[PDB]
Amino acid sequence: MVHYYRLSLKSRQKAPKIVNSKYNSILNIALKNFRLCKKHKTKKPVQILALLQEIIPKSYFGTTTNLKRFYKVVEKILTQSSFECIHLSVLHKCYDYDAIPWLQNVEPNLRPKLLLKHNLFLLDNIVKPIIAFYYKPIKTLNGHEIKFIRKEEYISFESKVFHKLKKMKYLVEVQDEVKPRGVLNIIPKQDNFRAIVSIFPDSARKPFFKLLTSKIYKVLEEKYKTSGSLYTCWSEFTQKTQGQIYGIKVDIRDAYGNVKIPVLCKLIQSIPTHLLDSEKKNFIVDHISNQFVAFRRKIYKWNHGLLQGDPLSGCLCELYMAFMDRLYFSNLDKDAFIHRTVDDYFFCSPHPHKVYDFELLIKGVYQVNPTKTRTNLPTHRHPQDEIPYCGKIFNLTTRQVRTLYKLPPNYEIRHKFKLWNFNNQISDDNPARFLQKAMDFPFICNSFTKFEFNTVFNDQRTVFANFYDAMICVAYKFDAAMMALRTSFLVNDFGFIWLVLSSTVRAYASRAFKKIVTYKGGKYRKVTFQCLKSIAWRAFLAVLKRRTEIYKGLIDRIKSREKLTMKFHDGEVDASYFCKLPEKFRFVKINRKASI
Ligand SMILES: C/C(=C\C(=O)Nc1ccccc1C(=O)O)c1ccc2ccccc2c1
């Protein structure tokens, strides 16, 4: 069954003092040096690879080549994404067994099993714990990216935020005679922080909550006549509006924490009797206040709106926010464009003054991030035609919609992808399946919607750009699969790749063709399967070229075997777009190296 070792620190073990009957005594030395390293207080920054090379004696590996093989694993762990694994067989395949001293008294055929077992011990008891001792792993939530923050820096940060919450209303010290139902976690968020709770969970039953919130999502679409579909709204809006569109996007600051608890309670109380009535309402009422959380041995009451992390917060915040909408957003206009999420409001009208009446109004209702506001109003400092909202870029002038990406500088794009599924494991000798599973559609589905492929409001040149961009993402996933195929499946002949790559271009071109047909509108000119296939090949070429030495032969095969030229039907097309990496994709990091 089991093929994978998970790279996550979460699975580390607490090391014994010495080892048992099973393990060779050499592991005791490393355990010792591990404890010694932890006790040594040094002024100058910690390089894990360098420490580990003092902790695990060289006699454990016998040769530099063996040592270098183990530490490539350590190096992945030092650079892991969430959910990433390697194969368990990486830990024994291709080691120089004749050169490992502690293994000479064992006949050759039992060696790999022992090496695997001891390697696992080291990684579980020494490598992962050393990292945990010096670093806090932080999920940036930008894909599966993990950042490793020096533990003293994090604790300092964690304390500095803890006192701010203390010396505000947000966190009040409790007498311990309340008993918490989750632990307060402080997460660094770019410039600020996020104070969420991790539940045990259990709490009576988890299905009780799921069919409790299910009772609420009813109420949301009952006494609030809201419907809303971003695509339908934008489409119906743009088609009736002939003149220049004006619009604004307003970022709502901490919607969860700006919930006025008393107001939400009265909202819950009355009147959903046919829907919830009393036994439920009473449990929700006291749930919103008081919210009590475990921390540093101490128990605290959270007095700043809903707690992010509580299962009910999301649906109750939506419930609350819909009420604020009926309350303060009543005189907007039946003919204006409006759409919202918990974090977002997006409003458009051909009447510029209404876009002010909206900006001013929304500032009166909510606390909003005013630097994160985007508008094309000429009175603003820096007016802007293109408005990002819900993973999309809306151009208020051209009405075109593009997918938003989405990439900090220095971001390693391999973090966007999930190649390893611990629940559905692929043996080390089926790389083709791994490849094919990686090229499956579901992951890229939100780049392949009516927003990207319609020709109602979007021009055909826009559909092509959207498509080319989605295929650049797919190509980067392909590239990241290639890296995994080399370092974990240990592939050396990449021949089988050609036909998998070819099928993939065929399949994505075909899904595009269908989507374009289904959502065809008056702006359609003529899209062939051939044209789409070429855009796709071009997208792969623009990524593969980033490793011309590795991908030389593949690039040449594409240029000699595939059709890369296409006929365009709009003279307004930017033909250059299809020649090169677009700048938003041009400087993502594709090289993996340890930095702690
Ligand atoms: C996809 C691929 C090669 C590949 O992935 N290589 C590597 C990946 C990671 C690390 C090292 C290497 C390496 O080869 O040195 C490839 C190249 C040329 C091809 C030509 C024709 C058909 C298929 C082809 C496949």
Side-chain angles (χ1 to χ4, degrees):
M1 183 175 75
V2 180
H3 298 111
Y4 292 175
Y5 176 69
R6 281 171 305 197
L7 304 186
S8 182
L9 258 43
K10 287 175 188 193
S11 41
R12 68 205 190 264
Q13 278 153 228
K14 177 174 181 175
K17 288 324 200 75
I18 68 171
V19 296
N20 53 89
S21 275
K22 286 151 56 207
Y23 298 108
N24 187 294
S25 274
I26 197 165
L27 297 180
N28 294 344
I29 300 164
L31 281 173
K32 166 79 178 174
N33 307 331
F34 181 37
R35 299 191 299 272
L36 255 11
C37 182
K38 283 187 282 182
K39 291 176 180 158
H40 183 216
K41 311 294 174 200
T42 138
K43 217 182 228 304
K44 290 283 158 68
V46 315
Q47 273 275 22
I48 268 62
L49 260 11
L51 284 179
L52 235 25
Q53 270 151 41
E54 304 169 350
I55 285 151
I56 315 179
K58 205 196 171 163
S59 53
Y60 174 80
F61 308 102
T63 56
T64 311
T65 313
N66 292 346
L67 174 156
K68 259 152 163 279
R69 191 173 271 110
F70 178 88
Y71 280 96
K72 287 269 107 273
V73 173
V74 171
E75 177 136 36
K76 284 193 161 184
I77 289 180
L78 286 171
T79 57
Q80 54 186 286
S81 283
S82 289
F83 291 115
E84 182 173 18
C85 301
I86 45 132
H87 290 85
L88 276 168
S89 71
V90 180
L91 296 179
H92 66 84
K93 270 177 148 73
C94 302
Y95 276 79
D96 192 357
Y97 285 97
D98 281 316
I100 300 160
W102 65 270
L103 276 177
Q104 293 302 83
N105 49 15
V106 186
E107 82 270 57
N109 56 83
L110 290 209
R111 282 170 191 184
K113 206 111 289 154
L114 274 169
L115 185 61
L116 171 72
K117 190 212 214 155
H118 294 236
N119 275 178
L120 283 173
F121 178 97
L122 292 170
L123 298 164
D124 283 329
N125 298 99
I126 305 204
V127 178
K128 284 163 174 199
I130 199 122
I131 299 169
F133 185 73
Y134 296 113
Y135 297 88
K136 194 60 146 46
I138 255 78
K139 298 187 198 292
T140 63
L141 298 181
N142 207 324
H144 305 97
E145 174 184 48
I146 291 162
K147 226 149 202 137
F148 286 110
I149 310 304
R150 292 205 61 175
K151 204 145 158 163
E152 42 279 321
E153 284 173 36
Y154 169 77
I155 289 173
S156 148
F157 164 93
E158 190 199 4
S159 283
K160 174 199 142 212
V161 167
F162 172 61
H163 290 295
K164 204 172 282 158
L165 297 173
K166 259 188 155 197
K167 252 37 93 83
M168 284 171 184
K169 338 221 168 217
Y170 304 178
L171 208 60
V172 170
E173 207 191 301
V174 148
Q175 301 84 4
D176 303 294
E177 191 84 297
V178 168
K179 199 166 182 175
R181 287 178 179 181
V183 63
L184 172 75
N185 225 55
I186 297 163
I187 312 297
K189 275 299 163 193
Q190 301 144 356
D191 195 66
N192 263 354
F193 72 87
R194 203 187 165 200
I196 60 170
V197 292
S198 301
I199 338 283
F200 291 99
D202 194 37
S203 54
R205 269 152 193 165
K206 200 183 176 178
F208 173 74
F209 282 132
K210 196 149 186 161
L211 271 90
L212 202 274
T213 174
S214 200
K215 273 195 161 182
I216 294 159
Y217 277 106
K218 292 182 190 180
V219 187
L220 226 186
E221 47 95 54
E222 292 290 326
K223 302 306 171 196
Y224 307 90
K225 277 191 180 176
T226 326
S227 55
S229 168
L230 222 202
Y231 181 87
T232 310
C233 292
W234 184 254
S235 183
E236 274 160 25
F237 176 76
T238 59
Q239 300 312 291
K240 61 193 179 181
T241 318
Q242 298 182 295
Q244 175 68 45
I245 289 162
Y246 291 94
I248 189 163
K249 191 261 295 185
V250 179
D251 235 56
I252 309 167
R253 188 169 278 181
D254 201 0
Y256 282 69
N258 285 138
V259 171
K260 313 129 210 265
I261 299 316
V263 168
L264 184 49
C265 297
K266 306 291 174 165
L267 216 184
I268 289 147
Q269 309 271 13
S270 272
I271 302 177
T273 61
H274 181 79
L275 314 150
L276 287 163
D277 212 33
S278 202
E279 342 85 78
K280 347 277 186 188
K281 92 165 100 165
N282 300 317
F283 178 78
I284 310 169
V285 166
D286 68 348
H287 214 245
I288 324 297
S289 50
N290 356 54
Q291 301 168 318
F292 30 71
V293 293
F295 203 52
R296 300 167 171 179
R297 290 194 269 170
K298 297 171 286 179
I299 304 148
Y300 286 80
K301 263 185 209 170
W302 185 262
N303 276 310
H304 188 237
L306 294 165
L307 261 173
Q308 266 158 304
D310 194 311
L312 280 180
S313 287
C315 71
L316 289 177
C317 186
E318 286 194 55
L319 196 264
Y320 179 85
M321 292 288 278
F323 179 60
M324 299 278 103
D325 190 284
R326 199 155 43 105
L327 215 49
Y328 307 116
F329 299 96
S330 41
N331 302 114
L332 295 171
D333 189 339
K334 202 218 140 185
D335 295 315
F337 173 95
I338 313 102
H339 198 278
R340 57 180 228 78
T341 64
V342 271
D343 325 330
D344 283 314
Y345 263 81
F346 184 35
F347 178 94
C348 305
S349 166
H351 307 300
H353 80 264
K354 290 192 218 292
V355 186
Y356 298 99
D357 299 349
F358 188 91
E359 186 177 21
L360 279 70
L361 162 63
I362 218 263
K363 265 163 178 155
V365 179
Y366 298 113
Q367 219 82 293
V368 304
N369 303 331
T371 81
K372 278 222 152 199
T373 301
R374 300 296 186 266
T375 176
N376 62 332
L377 289 164
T379 56
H380 274 245
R381 289 151 162 82
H382 306 105
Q384 223 175 251
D385 274 357
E386 310 210 309
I387 308 302
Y389 176 79
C390 290
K392 261 76 188 184
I393 299 155
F394 299 77
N395 183 310
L396 299 181
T397 298
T398 60
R399 293 100 187 280
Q400 303 310 97
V401 181
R402 301 281 302 272
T403 306
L404 167 73
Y405 315 89
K406 214 192 55 171
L407 293 317
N410 304 329
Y411 185 86
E412 277 177 88
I413 190 86
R414 73 180 158 83
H415 284 304
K416 241 27 180 259
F417 309 118
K418 175 180 196 201
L419 308 180
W420 307 91
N421 180 358
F422 201 74
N423 308 299
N424 200 4
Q425 318 203 350
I426 302 177
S427 87
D428 61 3
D429 70 0
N430 206 336
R433 178 184 164 200
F434 180 86
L435 220 206
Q436 294 156 357
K437 191 184 149 86
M439 293 294 100
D440 278 344
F441 175 80
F443 87 96
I444 187 87
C445 74
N446 268 310
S447 227
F448 259 62
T449 71
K450 338 180 260 291
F451 265 121
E452 284 84 13
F453 289 105
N454 82 88
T455 44
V456 181
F457 52 90
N458 271 354
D459 292 295
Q460 180 172 312
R461 63 197 215 248
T462 296
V463 169
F464 288 160
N466 286 328
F467 182 60
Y468 178 72
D469 284 349
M471 293 312 298
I472 290 283
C473 294
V474 169
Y476 270 128
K477 210 207 212 214
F478 169 91
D479 170 63
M482 286 320 92
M483 290 309 98
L485 290 179
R486 155 61 78 160
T487 59
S488 171
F489 286 79
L490 308 186
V491 174
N492 24 49
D493 192 318
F494 291 89
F496 76 88
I497 268 93
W498 181 242
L499 292 157
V500 181
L501 182 50
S502 302
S503 298
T504 308
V505 169
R506 181 258 135 200
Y508 275 97
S510 165
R511 285 185 212 106
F513 189 94
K514 278 183 179 46
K515 256 76 162 74
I516 284 169
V517 164
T518 298
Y519 301 119
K520 183 175 288 176
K523 296 185 178 173
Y524 178 76
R525 325 273 275 246
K526 175 184 177 189
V527 175
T528 69
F529 183 79
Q530 292 66 44
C531 182
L532 288 166
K533 203 145 67 94
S534 293
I535 292 181
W537 280 121
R538 282 197 183 245
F540 271 93
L541 284 181
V543 164
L544 293 170
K545 265 161 141 199
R546 289 195 67 174
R547 304 191 209 272
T548 33
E549 68 297 326
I550 278 144
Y551 289 136
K552 181 102 177 66
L554 185 49
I555 300 165
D556 291 340
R557 183 170 291 190
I558 298 171
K559 294 190 169 171
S560 52
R561 281 193 198 185
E562 306 313 311
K563 170 68 102 168
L564 301 170
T565 55
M566 57 273 202
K567 186 185 188 153
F568 290 114
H569 292 97
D570 180 339
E572 215 93 7
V573 77
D574 184 349
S576 62
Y577 197 69
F578 306 94
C579 279
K580 56 195 171 64
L581 248 14
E583 313 320 86
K584 65 198 187 215
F585 292 120
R586 190 159 91 98
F587 311 112
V588 306
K589 262 212 251 150
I590 69 178
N591 289 325
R592 203 177 176 158
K593 213 173 75 72
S595 181
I596 73 290

